[PDB]
Amino acid sequence: AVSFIGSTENDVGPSQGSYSSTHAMDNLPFVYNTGYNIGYQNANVWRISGGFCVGLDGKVDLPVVGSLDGQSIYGLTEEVGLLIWMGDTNYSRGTAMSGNSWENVFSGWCVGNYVSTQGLSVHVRPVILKRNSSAQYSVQKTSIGSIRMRPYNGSSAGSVQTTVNFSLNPFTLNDTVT
Ligand SMILES: CC(=O)N[C@@H]1[C@@H](O)[C@H](O)[C@@H](CO)O[C@H]1O
Ligand SMILES: CC(=O)N[C@@H]1[C@@H](O)[C@H](O)[C@@H](CO)O[C@H]1O
């Protein structure tokens, strides 16, 4: 069996956080080293039991404005982009996102004759896109995409909520250019 125990709408990163970085103007696109700080994580989004098998698919709705090392650079503003990862609970298990389609972000696992849970995580990193002198960039609260649980091996979601959404909290980038 499966049931939904998380939240439908989830914020990514601290609200109106400020991030500073320094980069050479010739080093673009530039990814801010924010670690897993601009993210969301919850080990308990679905409760599963009795042989239920489940994985996760992720979808980013932001426009693809570029590509970096095999993953999409999603657009926020003309000057700021975003790299995105979605996956199982541990941030380290995040899957690099590309495109705007539902992608497998967690191969899945099957619970046995007991009850457990299925979680998820999302983290992103800001990207400076255009050459410019030192400047401050502001990013508005913006919807990013979603993550859906995906039953397999004959398991079924039935009427259970399968999808949750993620909204990027506003932030400011204090960009120093050398
Ligand atoms: C409470 C807890 O840790 N539950 C985790 C869940 O978050 C994760 O999605 C799943 C698959 O790795 O393993 C469970 O044990
Ligand atoms: C278009 C679409 O829904 N893509 C799904 C993908 O999410 C899923 O991970 C994969 C196998 O699990 O099967 C594809 O059909």
Curated annotation (Swiss-Prot):
Keyword Amino-acid biosynthesis: no
Disulfide bond entries: C53-C110
GO biological process: adhesion of symbiont to host; cell adhesion involved in single-species biofilm formation
Main location: other
Annotated stretches, region: Receptor-binding lectin domain: 1-177
Domain of life: Bacteria
Family to which this protein belongs: Belongs to the fimbrial protein family.
Known role: Essential fimbrial adhesion factor that mediates binding to N-acetylglucosamine-containing receptors in the host intestinal microvilli, leading to colonization of the intestinal tissue, and diarrhea or septicemia. Also confers adhesiveness to laminin and basement membranes. May be involved in the initiation of polymerization of fimbrillin monomers during fimbrial filament biogenesis.
Protein name as annotated: F17g-G fimbrial adhesin
Organism of this sequence: Escherichia coli
Underlying gene: f17gG
